[PDB]
Amino acid sequence: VDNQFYSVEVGDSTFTVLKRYQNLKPIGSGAQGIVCAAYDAVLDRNVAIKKLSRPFQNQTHAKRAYRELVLMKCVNHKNIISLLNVFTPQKTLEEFQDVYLVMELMDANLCQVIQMELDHERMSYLLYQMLCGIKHLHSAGIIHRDLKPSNIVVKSDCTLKILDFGLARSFMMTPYVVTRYYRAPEVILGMGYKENVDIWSVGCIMGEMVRHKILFPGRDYIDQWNKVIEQLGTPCPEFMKKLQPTVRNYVENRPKYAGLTFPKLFPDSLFPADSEHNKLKASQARDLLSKMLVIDPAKRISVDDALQHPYINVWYDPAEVEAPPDEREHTIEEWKELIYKEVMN
Ligand SMILES: Nc1ncnc2c1ncn2[C@@H]1O[C@H](COP(=O)(O)OP(=O)(O)NP(=O)(O)O)[C@@H](O)[C@H]1O
Ligand SMILES: [Mg+2]
Q: Residues 178, 181, 187, CA angle at the centre, nearest 5°? A: 80
Which CATH number is 5-107's, of 3.40.50.720, 3.30.200.20, 3.40.50.10860, 1.10.357.10?
3.30.200.20
d(CA 64, CA 276): 47
Resolution (A): 1.9
SS (H, E, C) the chain: CHHHEEEEEECCEEEEEECCEEEEEEEEEECCEEEEEEEECCCCEEEEEEEEECHHHCHHHHHHHHHHHHHHHHCCCCCECCEEEEECCCCCCCCCCEEEEEEECCCEEHHHHHCCCCCHHHHHHHHHHHHHHHHHHHHCCCCCCCCCHHHEEECCCCCEEECCCCCCCCCCCCCCCCCCCCCCHHHHCCCCCCCCHHHHHHHHHHHHHHHCCCCCCCCCHHHHHHHHHHHHCCCCHHHHCCCCHHHHHHHHCCCCCCCCCHHHHCCHHHCCCCCHHHHHHHHHHHHHHHHHCCCCCCCCCCHHHHHCCCCCHHHCCHHHHCCCCCCCCCCHHHHHHHHHHHHHC
Q: How far is the CA of 71 from the centre of ligand 2 (A)?
A: 16
Contact criterion met (CB below 8 Å) for 300 and 292 = yes
Amino acid symbol at 175:
P
Q: How far is the CA of 282 from the centre of ligand 2 (A)?
A: 30
**Number of the ligand 1 atom closest to the C-alpha atom of 30:** 22
Report which protein residue has its CA nearest ligand 1's atom 14.
29
What residues pair up with 13 in beta bridges, in sequence order? 10
Contacts with 226 (C-beta within 8 Å, 6 or more apart), sequence order: 218, 254
Distances (CA, A) of 285 to 66, 158, 209, 302, 311: 38, 18, 11, 16, 6
Domain regions of the chain by residue span: 5-107, 108-325
Instruction: Calculate helix-pair angle for 59-74, 332-344, nearest 10 degrees.
Output: 20
d(CA 129, CA 2): 40
- Which ligand approaches the C-alpha of residue 165 most closely? 1
Q: How far is the CA of 33 from the centre of ligand 1 (A)?
A: 9
- The reply to whether domains 5-107 and 108-325 share a CATH topology is no
d(CA 85, CA 100): 8
Give the determination technique.
Answer: X-ray
Q: What architecture does CATH give domain 108-325?
A: Orthogonal Bundle (1.10)
Report which protein residue has its CA nearest ligand 1's atom 21.
30
- Which ligand approaches the C-alpha of residue 164 most closely? 1
d(CA 84, CA 142): 21
State the sign of the Cα–Cα–Cα–Cα dihedral 265, 269, 272, 274. positive
Q: Which residues surround ligand 1 with Cβ inside 6 Å?
A: 27-32, 35, 48, 50, 81, 103, 105-106, 109, 150-151, 153, 163-164
Of 35, 103, 174, the residue with max ligand 1 atoms within 8 A of its CB, to mutate for a pocket test, comes to: 35
